[PDB]
Motif scaffolding. Structure first.
Motif, PDB file in Angstrom:
ATOM      1  N   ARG A 176      30.266  40.702  38.606  1.00 16.05           N
ATOM      2  CA  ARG A 176      31.504  41.054  37.886  1.00 16.05           C
ATOM      3  C   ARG A 176      31.311  40.713  36.395  1.00 16.05           C
ATOM      4  O   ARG A 176      32.208  40.146  35.765  1.00 16.05           O
ATOM      5  N   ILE A 219      33.013  43.534  33.726  1.00  9.94           N
ATOM      6  CA  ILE A 219      34.274  44.153  34.178  1.00  9.94           C
ATOM      7  C   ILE A 219      35.484  43.301  33.738  1.00  9.94           C
ATOM      8  O   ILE A 219      36.485  43.840  33.241  1.00  9.94           O
ATOM      9  N   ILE A 274      41.021  51.000  33.035  1.00  9.95           N
ATOM     10  CA  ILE A 274      39.906  51.071  34.029  1.00  9.95           C
ATOM     11  C   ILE A 274      39.560  52.517  34.356  1.00  9.95           C
ATOM     12  O   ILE A 274      40.357  53.235  34.965  1.00  9.95           O
ATOM     13  N   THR A 295      36.916  54.673  36.544  1.00  9.82           N
ATOM     14  CA  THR A 295      35.821  54.627  37.503  1.00  9.82           C
ATOM     15  C   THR A 295      34.857  55.742  37.223  1.00  9.82           C
ATOM     16  O   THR A 295      35.137  56.641  36.417  1.00  9.82           O
ATOM     17  N   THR A 308      29.165  49.580  35.379  1.00 11.67           N
ATOM     18  CA  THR A 308      28.813  48.384  36.116  1.00 11.67           C
ATOM     19  C   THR A 308      29.448  48.527  37.474  1.00 11.67           C
ATOM     20  O   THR A 308      30.548  49.044  37.580  1.00 11.67           O
ATOM     21  N   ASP A 320      31.374  47.143  40.652  1.00 11.57           N
ATOM     22  CA  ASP A 320      32.366  46.107  40.863  1.00 11.57           C
ATOM     23  C   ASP A 320      32.255  45.635  42.317  1.00 11.57           C
ATOM     24  O   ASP A 320      32.591  46.398  43.211  1.00 11.57           O
ATOM     25  N   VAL A 343      32.596  50.973  37.446  1.00  8.22           N
ATOM     26  CA  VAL A 343      33.549  51.028  36.329  1.00  8.22           C
ATOM     27  C   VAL A 343      32.840  51.270  35.013  1.00  8.22           C
ATOM     28  O   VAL A 343      31.913  50.527  34.634  1.00  8.22           O
ATOM     29  N   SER A 393      31.545  50.877  31.716  1.00  5.95           N
ATOM     30  CA  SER A 393      31.423  49.659  30.917  1.00  5.95           C
ATOM     31  C   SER A 393      30.665  49.835  29.589  1.00  5.95           C
ATOM     32  O   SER A 393      30.601  48.898  28.791  1.00  5.95           O
TER      33      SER A 393
END
Lengths: 321, 321, 321, 321
Positions: free
Chosen positions: A41, A44, B1, B3, B174, B176, B183, B185
């Protein structure tokens, strides 16, 4: 299938350890599981050139809580560009734990791997943030060639592994992601007496001693097998040391022009690794004398580290002679 | 966020891609999630070297199933100490995907990180284990400086990251662990035009050209900032390339005594990375000409790779001149 | 292996849906994954009675964020011992989503299972906490026997399942915990036209109508197979409806002494389930007329629900006649 | 935050248990984690009714391996539509563990929740598939009102919980999905002396005794609070017992027309639950005498179970008088 738990108990079973310690070690493993997440994580939570340092912090908080039962814990701050180091002092007073939360504080060096290192001693004094005097005590109570009972590291990379010794050989446990349990995956691990691999930051080649340049150059001419050495340098202490652990060779952070006495820290970094490397059939050195032989006088005390296969370190010690 | 899913769709939204492709890419991400596990559950299942090699295999099986919907897929074998490479051909016949499951087949090189690489083309001819002729077709249909539509890699290390371009900049997601979702990043990632880091296997220093030794030595004299270059060499292709991606510098697998034409393979390894590096503001080369300019004539065709910050590669190309 | 993602896209592929909607549904699935965790991490975070209610709240927050991209979302509050209900209104203005976050607000009823329910309409007018007038608009724009485009539920129990219809049959996806992906596990699901199971709170037996007691007693005399009916009543709406979904029978929340017009709410609870049960070959009723036939006049409007196998509901409607 | 591990050790710490047992219990918890997955990955692997039964099997294999260290384990087959039951016999010969892998073998009953139940005894003489004679020994060595040392269950539903007693109160641990650890979430749990909830299969109302119908009907007339009882019947033994555990009331599997001596099995199902319910301040009965008072004479021996709040069971025992 033997878990870390099972195995721990079975150590206390053969009275190698006491309960009070089986608890400290068990507590530590959890803290590691939790830090592993943090690291995965990674970016994030940090959406809410710096991520590694804000994370050093959190990981010590995690350590703190996870052993609240066993002891009380305080933080030797990052006095330069370093990791702050947590220390637990058992309420019982029988044990003291020194915990490097993550090898490094550089974003670059942690871009694929990192890890926590710890060693556990057996004090005399009720030595008890941590203000100067308060500290020094620690230096005097942590005597790595003496009271150092157990030590280990956890690496956070493609796999998460916990490596550990209590005094009778080194053992390695892979973390099982599905079920969240450490499984013994390496029995009494032995470091090749030789290995043809070398881990150095060669960008500092021109800041080194001639004695040392000759060592490093000695390595590049082939064979006689026509086969030179291999260089691998992750830049992650736990990573580079782990690979050396399994596959042998030599890892090195030498002193140079800019860094008169190395860069790694004796008590937090070097003394634990070496102790582990000795336990696995290798040598841990400063170029001249075994690194545990050494008694920490100073506080955030630095040193050159040369560690790995037993023959490869001797071969170095010789060139520096 | 945002995805990976969301973002994918939104690409198809701006008609950058079609549905039929949004499916291929989405399918691929899953396969990556699955291979990440494999790699973490690394030596727990294997309690029931060649941990790495047995694993190359499985990962292609994973790839195969995950795109069964979109196409049909076969395996160009490991004609030696290599990774076998899966290839999917869309039933629609519109697309072809080339998938290196894991960067390497060495236990040691994968001891902290590894990864899959893939690139996707738009064919003319229908190609359908894969026997010789059967293959060559592929070489002729995969034209990296032409029909190469999208490409990327997934790294499996402390964090799992998926890096990708469809033609309009590079983006990084990255994974999760809690919720099992990628997600976004890293938005349109840009490679420092300069960086003072170099990635080479310097153990082969004595198998190199004088032209090249001069390059490498040029790097070690300080500054003028009194600051030399930094050397970091994981030995993992995806790892080393990722770090370069984010932090700039140069990555290099050169030709030498024993390896007349490098060691990395043009179509599977080099052509995808370069395309990505060009998309991020860097250069991908063979010492003399950009690596995509090159048309694969041979089959498991090798090449030197020099890739990274745009200035650092030019500087090399010059010494080899 | 077909994921929810794949399958979604393939629906938009056959132009059953538009992109703008493929996004809403994809967004929703994530939100569900997240709520599943909440529910599992149930009483670990809540170490830092009434645990269910505090959780109703959070789950709407989760919904909110997960569709921030598609639309804007507000909350119709809990006017009795109910769940507050989120509503999203697409920026594009084409869609409106009504989201019951968790079936219930009782600790007891959620002690082993719970779930979210949602239905999606196509408005004609702009509705814009949500003050009275503001709401009523909604009642008038959500016309369940008309503009109701898609609907579904996610159940959080031993397995997590997402069940869904867009107008052409019902499909079920099990959530894969390892890789965090929904996998299609039930193709066009069909409700047994008959089933010998009944779900009622029989503790209210004495608050019922004679008409209804006769129904319920009719069920308990054996066979003629010597085999009576089976009673199963979890007390969880989504749970009980799910079992009925797969294994057939009848689910019922009837009106009684204390509750003149049932207890379940027409728009949030009953209209979505029924629409789904009709799509799977069953019937959804109020004892006298199909439940979708019904147009919501009131606001938090209640109703009896009788839903399940097609024959079992007819058989009831008859006794209430 | 106290894990199951921590807490276990601390029990051995206060010498409540020995190491050799701390291992058995720790081994068991893992096996449970593994079975939880199975149950969640429920119908994803089974894409490669009848799903529950094939799964009963696997879960015993899981149990077997997880305690291979501690002992040797064999399987009393399914002599009916039952679950096969694993039994471990410690090499030590000190302990014997009886393990119901999953409460049921019906697809319906496990459609939202299930669970494993176990009790541990303290033999004299060792029994050494399990052929008849071989078994009976077990009946004679497992004496539930005597040598029964510890017991528990693990429920697999919306949350996974492990509930347990070693003789000094009942404790409950929720499984933490992120980190894969059981966390103590219920300290010394106490069963309401009263509760207005009843769990029975009322579809069998007409196969019961008049004595019993009167009990059940007694429940449905209101109050005097105007508030009748609540009926909840999942059909899952572990589920229904768990809810009772926390919220009080009565659970019941009575004898009837077709089932002369109940349906639940004394040694595997009833004796463990009761022992736990007694440890939490409730009563476990057969309608006439406490269920632990009873000595198993037969082999797969059945019994009526009435278990829950202490007052509610007395109130029943009276009507059956």
């Amino acid at each position: 299938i033997t878990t870390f738990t099972t195995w721990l108990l079975k150590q206390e079973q053969a009275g190698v350890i006491d309960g009070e310690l089986t608890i400290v070690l068990s507590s530590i493993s959890l803290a590691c599981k939790q830090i592993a997440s943090l690291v995965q994580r990674a970016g994030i939570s940090n959406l809410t050139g710096e991520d590694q340092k804000k994370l050093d912090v959190i990981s010590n908080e995690v350590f703190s809580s996870c052993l609240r039962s066993s002891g009380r814990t305080g933080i030797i701050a990052s006095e330069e560009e370093d990791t702050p180091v947590a220390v637990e002092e058992s309420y019982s007073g029988n044990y003291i734990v020194v915990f490097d939360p993550l090898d490094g504080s550089s974003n670059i060096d942690a871009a694929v791997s990192t890890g926590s290192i710890f060693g556990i001693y057996k004090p005399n004094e009720e030595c008890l943030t941590i203000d100067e005097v308060a500290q020094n005590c620690v230096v005097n109570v942590c005597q790595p060639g003496s009271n150092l009972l157990s030590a280990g590291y956890c690496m956070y990379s493609s796999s998460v592994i916990l490596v550990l010794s209590v005094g009778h050989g080194v053992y390695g446990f892979t973390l099982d992601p599905l079920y969240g349990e450490f499984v013994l995956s390496h029995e009494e691990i032995k470091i090749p007496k030789s290995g043809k691999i070398y881990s150095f930051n060669e960008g500092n080649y021109a800041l080194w001693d001639d004695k040392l340049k000759k060592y490093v150059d000695s390595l590049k001419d082939p064979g006689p097998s026509g086969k030179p050495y291999s260089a691998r340098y992750i830049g992650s202490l736990v990573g580079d040391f782990h690979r050396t652990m399994l596959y042998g060779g030599i890892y090195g952070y030498p002193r140079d022009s800019k860094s008169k006495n190395g860069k790694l820290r004796l008590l937090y970094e070097c003394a634990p690794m070496s102790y582990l490397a000795e336990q696995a059939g290798g040598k841990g050195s400063d170029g001249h004398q075994r690194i545990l032989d050494i008694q920490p006088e100073q506080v955030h005390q630095r040193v050159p580290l040369y560690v790995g296969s037993t023959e490869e370190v001797e071969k170095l010690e010789k060139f520096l002679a």
